[PDB]
Amino acid sequence: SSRTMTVDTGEELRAFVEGLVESGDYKTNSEVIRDGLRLLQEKTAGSKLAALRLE
Amino acid sequence: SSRTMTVDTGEELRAFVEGLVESGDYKTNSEVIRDGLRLLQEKTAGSKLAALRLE
Amino acid sequence: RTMTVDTGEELRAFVEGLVESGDYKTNSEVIRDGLRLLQEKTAGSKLAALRL
Amino acid sequence: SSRTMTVDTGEELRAFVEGLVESGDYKTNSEVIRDGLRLLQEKTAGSKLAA
Amino acid sequence: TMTVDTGEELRAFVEGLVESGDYKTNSEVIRDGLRLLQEKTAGSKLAALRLE
Amino acid sequence: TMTVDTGEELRAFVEGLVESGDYKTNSEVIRDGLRLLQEKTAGSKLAALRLE
Amino acid sequence: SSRTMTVDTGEELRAFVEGLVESGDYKTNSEVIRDGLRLLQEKTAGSKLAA
Amino acid sequence: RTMTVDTGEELRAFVEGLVESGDYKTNSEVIRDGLRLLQEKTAGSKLAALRL
Amino acid sequence: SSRTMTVDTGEELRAFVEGLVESGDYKTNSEVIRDGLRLLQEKTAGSKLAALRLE
Amino acid sequence: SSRTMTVDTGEELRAFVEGLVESGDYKTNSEVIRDGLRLLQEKTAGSKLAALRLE
Amino acid sequence: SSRTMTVDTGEELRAFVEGLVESGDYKTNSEVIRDGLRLLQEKTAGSKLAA
Amino acid sequence: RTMTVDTGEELRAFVEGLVESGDYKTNSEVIRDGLRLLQEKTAGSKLAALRL
Amino acid sequence: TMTVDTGEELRAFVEGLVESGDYKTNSEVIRDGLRLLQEKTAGSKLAALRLE
Amino acid sequence: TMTVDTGEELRAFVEGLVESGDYKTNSEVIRDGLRLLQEKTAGSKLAALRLE
Amino acid sequence: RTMTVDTGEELRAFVEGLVESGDYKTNSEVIRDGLRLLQEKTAGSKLAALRL
Amino acid sequence: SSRTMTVDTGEELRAFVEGLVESGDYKTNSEVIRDGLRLLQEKTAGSKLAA
C-alpha cells in the first residue's frame, strides 16, 4: 500500500505545505500532498474531458 | 526557487499521478503534484476557515 | 467498536470546543458527525460514480 | 493535552473508514478522521451560526 | 413518547424558539428538526447510493 | 432531560437512523436535527432581519 | 369535509399574518394561509423524500 | 390565539395527509410550518429590503 | 383596502386562471391575479433596473 | 382570442400596476396583469407539484 | 417623439412573434416586442458593462 | 418583412440610447436582439417543455 | 469599416446565422459577438482588478 | 476575407483589446467574439429545441 | 515577443485540432486564448484577493 | 511531431506568464502554458458545441 516519490514543489508551495502542517490540520507533509491529489482526482473524475475521453 | 521533498502518496494515488503524466496533460510527476497543491491552495484561501482565522 | 486515532492537539481543541458549546455531548459524537459529512461527500462524489 | 483520541464509531462507520484506507486514497484510519474533522471545521467556520 | 438528552444549550435553543412564538411547544421544535433531518437524509446522495 | 412527542413514524425514522449505525443513540439523532435547525435558524434572512 | 379551518397560530404568527394583510398584498387572513400552504405543498412535492 | 380561515377542500386534504404521514401532529402544526416558510421568504425578499 | 379593475387577459390565460381555481390551490380568480402580481412585484423589486433607476 | 374579467386586486397592488404603466414599460393595465400571469404560468409549469400531479 | 415603431424583423422573427400571439399568452405583436425590450432593458441595466 | 408596433415613448428612448451608444446600428437591430432573447427564453422555458 | 480574417468555417457560422433569419446581415452577427465579448470583458474579475 | 460595419465605438473596443496586449490583431478579437457567440448558440435551449 | 515552451505531443495535437477546426487561425492564437482564460481565473481567484 | 512550441504571446501576456513563475506557483514558463491549455481543453470538452 505504501509508495514514496521525490517531487520538486518549489519554495513557495513548500512553504504553503509546511504552513498547513504547522496549523495542525494535517500531521505530515505527505498528508497535505495526498489531500491535494485527492482534490485533483475528484476534479479529474467529474471533468467533462474525462466524460469525453470515455465515449 | 527550486525545492524538493520526498512524500509517501501510496500506490493508488501514485498510479493516479502516473496516469496524468501518461496522458500528456502534464510533463512530470512534480507538475501533477504542483497542480494539486495549487488547487488545495486556492481552496484554502477562499475557505471560510481562512476568513475566520484572519479576524 | 472503538478506533484509536492521531488527531493532533489543534484538532482536539476544535473537537473539545464543539463539546463545550453543548451542540455535541461527547468527543466521539463530534467525530461521528465528521465521518457522516465525509461519507455523504464520498458517496455523492464524481469519483464515486466513476469507480462504479 | 493528547494528540491521540479513541473514538466510538460503531462497526458501520469503522467499516466506512477502513474502506477508504483499503481504497488507497488515505494511508491511515487517523488520516480519514482528520479529513472528516477538516470538513466539519470548514462547515462550522462558514456557518451563519458562526457569524 | 421519546426522552432525549439534549444538553441545556440545546434546551435553551428550543425554548427560545417557543418563546419567539413561531413554535407552540418544545415537541414541535424537535419534530421540525427531525423533518429537516429526514428531508436531508432522503435526498442524500448516500441514500441515493444505498436505495437509488 | 427533555421529553418530546414525536409520533411513531418519527420514532421509526430516528430508530432507523440508529440501526444504520451512522448514529449511536436516539438522542444523537435529535441533537443532529436540532443542530440542523439551529444552523438554518441562524442563517435565516429573518434572523438577519431581527438581529442583522 | 370542511373548507373552513380554525388554526392555533399564536399571537406572533397572527401578527405576521395581519401585517401582510395590512400591507395590502393579501386581501384576507385566509389568503395568507393559502399562500403559505402553497409554499409547503410545492416543497413537499419536490422534496427528495417525496421521490 | 386562533384564526378562522377558508382553506378549501383540496388544501385541507393536503393538510390532513401531512398529518396522517405522522410528520405533523395537528392541522394547526402544518399551518404554522407553512407560515414559517412564508415568513422566511417574506423577510429575505428583495421587496422586503426595498420597503425598508 | 379593496379595489377592482376589469382586465383583458385573453382566453388562454383566462383558462390558465380558471384551472388554478379549479385545483383548489386558490379560492377566487382575484386571488390568482393577486398572486401573479405579487410575483411580478418581487421580480421588479430585485431587478437590476429598479436598482439602476434608484441611483 | 379576447376575454375580459373584473378582479379585486386591492389598492396597494393596483398602485403597483399603475406605476408600471406610468413607467412606460407596459402600455395598459391589462398588459401588466398578463405579464404577471405569464410569470405565474411559467412557475406553475416547472413546479415539482405540476410534475408530481402529472405522474 | 413616436410611440409607434416599424421594425425590420424578417419573416422568421415575425413568424416567432405571430406564434406567441396565436398561443394567446400575448394579445398583440406590440406586446411581444415590449416583452423582449423589457428583457433587454433588464439585461443591459444589470450588465457589468452598465456598472 | 416589417412589423408596426406600439413601443411607447420611454421604450423608444431606451431603444435610441442603445443606438447612440454605438453597440447597435439601427432601431430594428435593437428589437431583433430583444426578440432573440425572448425566443431563447421561450424555447428553454419549462412551459415550452410542458406544451410539447 | 473593418476588414477581418475569419477563416471560412467562421464565415459559414455567420452566414448560417443570417440564413436562420434571427439576424439580417453578417455585420449584425459580428456586432452581436462583440457585444457578447464586451459584456464578458467588462464583467471580468480581471477588469475588476484593473479598474475596480 | 470578411468586411463588417462595426461602427466606431465597437472599433474602439476592439482596438482597446489589441492595445491591452491580450490580443494581437483586430481579427483575433472578432474571432474570439464569434467563438463566444458560437458556443452560446450551440448551447442554446433553442438550438436544443431545433436539433435536440 | 516569443516564448519557447514544452507542450508535449498530446497537447500539441489538441492545439492543432483547434486550428484545423478553423475556430483559431494559428497555434499561437490558441495559446493566447488559453492564457486569457488563466489570466481571468487568476485575477478572480480567492488567492488573488488574499495576496493583496 | 514536436513537443516544443514557440508562441507569439506579446510582451504583456509574457509578463503575465513570468509573473506566475516569479510567484513560485509554477516552475517554468512551459508549465504555465500547459495550465492554460488544460483550462481550454476542459472548456472545449464540456462545451455544448462539443456535444
Residue numbers in the entry:
A (entry chain C), B (entry chain C), I (entry chain C), J (entry chain C): 2 to 56
C (entry chain A), H (entry chain A), L (entry chain A), O (entry chain A): 4 to 55
D (entry chain D), G (entry chain D), K (entry chain D), P (entry chain D): 2 to 52
E (entry chain B), F (entry chain B), M (entry chain B), N (entry chain B): 5 to 56
What did the original publication write about this model?
Recently, PrpTA was found to be a pMBL6842-encoded type II TAS with the unique function to regulate the plasmid replication in Pseudoalteromonas rubra. It consists of stable PrpT toxin and labile PrpA antitoxin canonically positioned adjacently within the same operon. In this study, we reported for the first time the high-resolution structure of the PrpT:PrpA2:PrpT heterotetramer and two forms of crystal structures of truncated antitoxin-PrpA2–54. In addition, PrpA could also competitively bind to the iteron sequences in the ori, interfering with the binding of replication initiator RepB to the ori site, thus preventing the overreplication of the plasmid.
PrpA2–54-form I and II crystal structures both contain a doughnut-shaped hexadecamer formed by eight homodimers organized in a cogwheel-like form via inter-dimer interface dominated by salt bridges and hydrogen bonds. A circular hexadecamer (∼112.58 kDa) consisting of 8 PrpA2–54 dimers could be found in both forms of PrpA2–54 crystals. The maximum diameter of the annular doughnut-like hexadecamer is ∼80 Å and that of the hole in the center is approximately 22 Å. Apart from a type A-D dimer, either B or C could further dimerize with its symmetric mate generating type B-B# and type C-C# dimers (# represents symmetry mate). Since the dimer–dimer interfaces in AD-BB# and AD-CC# are similar to each other with an overall r.m.s.d. of 1.05 over 144 residues, only the AD-CC# interface will be, thus, discussed at length here. As demonstrated in Figure 6A (left), a functional PrpA2–54 tetramer is defined by inter-dimer crystallographic contacts between RHH domains with positively charged DNA-binding surfaces exposed to the solvent environment. The AD and CC# interact via a surface that is electrostatically complementary and somewhat slightly hydrophobic, especially the interface formed by α 2 helixes of PrpA. Salt bridges and hydrogen bonds below 4 Å are distributed mainly through the α 1–α 2 turn and α 2 helices of molecule AD together with almost equivalent parts of a molecule CC# [Figure 6A (right)]. In addition, the interface generated by AD and CC# dimers covers a total surface area of ∼1100 Å2, which is a little smaller than that of the dimerization interface. However, the inter-dimer interface of PrpA2–54 displays a novel feature that all monomers could participate in the formation of tetramer suggesting a much more extensive and strong contact.
